[model samples]
Target chain A: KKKVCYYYDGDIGNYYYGQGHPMKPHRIRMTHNLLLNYGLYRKMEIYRPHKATAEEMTKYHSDEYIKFLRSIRPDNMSEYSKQMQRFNVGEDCPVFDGLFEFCQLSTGGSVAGAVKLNRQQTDMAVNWAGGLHHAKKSEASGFCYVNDIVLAILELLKYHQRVLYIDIDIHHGDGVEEAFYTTDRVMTVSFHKYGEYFPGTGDLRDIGAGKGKYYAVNFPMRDGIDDESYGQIFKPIISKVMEMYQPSAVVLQCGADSLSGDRLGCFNLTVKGHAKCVEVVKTFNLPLLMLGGGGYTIRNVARCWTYETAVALDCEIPNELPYNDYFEYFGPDFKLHISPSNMTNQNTPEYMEKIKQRLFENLRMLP
Target chain B: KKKVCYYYDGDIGNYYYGQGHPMKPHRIRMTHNLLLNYGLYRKMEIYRPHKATAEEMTKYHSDEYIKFLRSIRPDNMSEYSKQMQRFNVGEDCPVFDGLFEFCQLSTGGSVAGAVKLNRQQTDMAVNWAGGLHHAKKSEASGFCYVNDIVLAILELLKYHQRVLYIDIDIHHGDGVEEAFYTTDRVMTVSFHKYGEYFPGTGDLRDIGAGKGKYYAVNFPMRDGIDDESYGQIFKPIISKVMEMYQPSAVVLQCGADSLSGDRLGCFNLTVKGHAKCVEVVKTFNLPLLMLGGGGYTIRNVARCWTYETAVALDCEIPNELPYNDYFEYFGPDFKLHISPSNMTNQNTPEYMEKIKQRLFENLRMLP
Candidate 1:
């Protein structure tokens, strides 16, 4: 059985992403409820979020950017409108009621998880509110305000010479990929939707630069990919990367937006299919850091994170959803599994084979 | 503009598919609420369900089955246990509150839609509570207790020379396809998940027999099909079908399960992609009857049916979901469109083209 540490901030749910915005902090609470009802909480060590100080966040983010996030508030938006534009914080990344505190709590969770992993306190550490992977060193992109993943990866690097960062979000993990683009120590592997998507930067040929050449691996794909097709490519590439890089630690960004029926995603993965990625990573038995990102559907986000929590703990929960405050939300099926649609998968086997061979060849150059 | 008549039973939401079952009748109400909040109610005529009588349902179901359904109750389930087993109503179909009335109301809506279409009272008719296609003559299967679609087609055949039935449910529309298996008057075309799925009967070779030879078109496909691939096959086959068969009227069963992120489906069809089928069928300029079927994710089912209703009315509603009684259900994104997943489209252009060519050849043999 794997020892797991779950990090959360109780006040995290109070933060709002503004009216009609795709990001919802409330889903974290819903996920907590699901975890409690599923009786998964008793099996793991729980920790409140370790609020990241301005100094701590400035480790990865620029000083001015960190200070801006620390001082920004919803009421003082007009005064700082120019600074907001400079930081790229308007519609996608908004100044909400508890904006700075929200950022601190989320960033804190990921950083603490990495700390826990470094201390060997837990084999696996989970921070479902983290994985805001698109935040740049000096700018906000996508819905993320802080580069929590970058901060955590930075923490992991203190104890481990090489830390692997894997992102399975529907959108490209551009911020993280760019942060370490020239560093051979962090091999950033991202599987994302390419071609006209938000912050579209990850290309198949955009591997790491200089010393990091062949270190950054991008597996970009089209819409409507299912479990079998995803696994066929995911398993082999990951297995090969493990054998080649042999990293001491792994950081996985389990962004739920890749799930089928996401409000802003195009991946047809079910909760089971998404959890399988976690399961596969768990099998490696390394110090693993798991964080959340990018799921627009609140109910699905809650369901997925809770299920992935179980996966990390190596525990099996019933498909029949247990009664919780949000019981009615899971009505109709009331099951943990969301079925994949019959939409045609655009990834051809020939294309998959070609990409696999190329990625494998790239891996072979890792010496 | 197409004059559309919408059917509803206010209490349709009260019906239950029993505990832990994948099917939920409440989705009907959820759809109704969505239609209301989207402000689509004023554009079309709304009618209460016709309350299908015993004799009326007998047009498709057997006398024994009809009698069994009419007399069975949850309180008296013990007495009807043997009868339940005979009708195959234990797990998939169960004794629930308002079981008989639920069937009647759902059946009534479809039958009444056909009646309205027959009388030329409406150019197109919608019954979101109907399209329970898998019920047989003397047995219930696939959560359907009545073959509302068949009864509607029976009413359709009263005045028309040929009535075309099209099912886009993930499960094979086995009951409807089988009912018209020996008749040329009804050309049953079903696009469903084939092999190892429930009610596994729809096959490419299971075309109609005797006078109905080459009339029943079963386009069976594997899982993880996407919108582009689906449209390629759906549009061409349906276009060819209209030309060769020349059916006087069309009955389309819009099963929400075929949409992406369905609780029991594997297709990655977005709400827009699912509605495209309705839009395509509407383009044929035939008297159309629209009925609802197998959607398990209640929110998604509501979204798809509401969108289809808008499509039928030729109304362009905003993608930002309007506030309603169940507003929180659409939280996170609160948008009308559910993005297609990154699931790979398993239906290759080659496979689709092959199926399309074969289907076109079969339509050539329609005479």
Candidate 2:
């Protein structure tokens, strides 16, 4: 039987920069509570994340950047460190007392998950709080600290010959793509919205360079494309890549932000759609390490991730939501039946045709 | 100068689907207060929208659907009307009192915006409660009615040869896409999250049929993608399509769900990213029609739409958020500084390169 491990700690709440920061660490606690409320904790092996060794983090981040982060001694930082010019780390990447500690915890969780997968202790591992894909080796970007995905990938590389890294976050997995852009051993695939939106990167033609050409596949979609389209393109492409590469393992970044209720996400996927992705990855029967990247809607995040857990465990939960206090988040007048059960299938004529045509046009593949 | 208009009636509060539904009408009042507080109403043409005529709605909806909707009064609906499953009404689209009236008012605002754009009374226009892309010619899929976008597009077609419809809502603009999927003259571009997402239609390959093959573009991105990646590809592809097709006007659905801190979306984007989209479209010097799509976070919705209004009027406001009682909506610790100013440019060199390569691989040319 496959083992699924989750990294969760009550102290993750301390990492929140403030009440105002979009990446609320309190959400981590909320998720735990919801999981516990739904009795999810009883079914899984839960681990308390440790701090990553400086040496481990150095494998992916720059030494100076690491030093800079370490030197930010929580309460006593110089004015330069408090300013934006200091590596753009003010309001966006605020230097809280335990910033580095949180990064260490997150990195350690991801690396530990990889180690578990490598040792066959678990066929599938989930660290729901670990997909910090935008952080650079030396700089924090997009609320990410140490680029845990990269750290985990680096750790995974220690054992696996080739690892397929899939990032399904609303933002492009730029840091991870950049980390593995020139490597042929690791294949990184990302799908994100592109425009003058933000960190302002992720185009469709960004195939990897040199040995990594065609390794980094990106499909930057237009707005309002729904789940039928995602399954059509994503499922076939990942499956094809799996068949072609036959990697020893796969890392899936299941960011719940792609769900319909995410505060910061533009995509409108239902909980089932989000959970189906986990189902798709599981069907591949590969050693998979899954991580949560970004999701702002606290309630939806709880719902989506919990649903994904259910799918991963092969549990067919009733369409009705599990009774919990989470319903209170919806306000008093909210109805319990928010979902349409019949909309479970992810196939449509228009979407199927579109997927086939797009694959043919871009990947030069036939459905 | 662009002429932006908003239709708000205090009495519109009566049209809410009641407290049981997720789409709270109280949001309208909250938005109004924010607009008033921010003085956005003074900058734009605040016209009270007139109820649309049955003929006006018939231009986009089917007569049978219209009759079906009309027959269902809020207080008393015939069992047959409530049981009309063929049209997807009742539970999901219940016949609330003033449902038709609400639809008429919102649809009228969209029509007025389209009219003003065609008449050159405004270089750009926006209706905060427009878009409503889920309503079909014969059914209501989401919490929408009349498909105002359809009516607005039809109105625009009266004078323009080509029209471009873009939906940024988390849900797929399935109804609109379905309505115009086979049409060549109207190009529908949507980017939404796929995999069991709502309305489950738009796919990457769902290009329009016949002459519209290349006209319809759908990029179903993964969840957790942020503002940076969204902008990178959006600018180029949208510009390419606009230049290639040169639509007479552009219809933009600025759904606040795409903004960070929203209750229902999953992506991480600040209000600034949302505004930048408007900025990019305005740069094209095209006649633009902006509409609000989906935003469940009432305060964030107000802030985002108010900012959009400021952008449409070409008014420059400081990035600092204005103080308002709405801050109470956020738990006790809401931060006043919504914009993460320190995060000036999180886009890394590698991210930019990847995006450029992706675009080159996917599209024929860059804008």
- Candidate 1 per-residue lDDT, tens place, A1-367, comes to 7799999888888888888898888899899989999899899999998788898899989999988988888788889999999999877787777788888999999999999999998999999999999999999988898999999999999999999999999988999999999999999999998988887788999999999899999998999998888988888899899999999999999999999889989889988888889988877889999999989888889899999999898887756677898988874336676766646689888888898898998999998
Root-mean-square deviation of Cα positions for candidate 1 versus the true structure, in angstroms: 22.5
List residue ranges in candidate 2 displaced over 4 A: A82-86, A319-327, A332-367, B1-367
Please give the C-alpha DockQ score of model 1: 0.02
Looking at model 1, residue B285 earns an lDDT score of: 97
Whole-model Cα lDDT of every candidate shown, in order: 0.88, 0.73
DockQ of each: 0.02, 0.01
Per-prediction fnat: 0.00, 0.00
- How much is the lDDT of residue A311 in candidate 1? 88
Task: Kindly report the root-mean-square deviation of model 2 from the true structure over all alpha carbons.
Answer: 24.4
Per residue, candidate 1 scores C-alpha lDDT tens digits across B264-295 of: 89999999888899989988999999999999
lDDT of 2 by residue, B187-272 (tens): 88776766676777776657667555566777665555567777776777778777777888889988777666567666567777
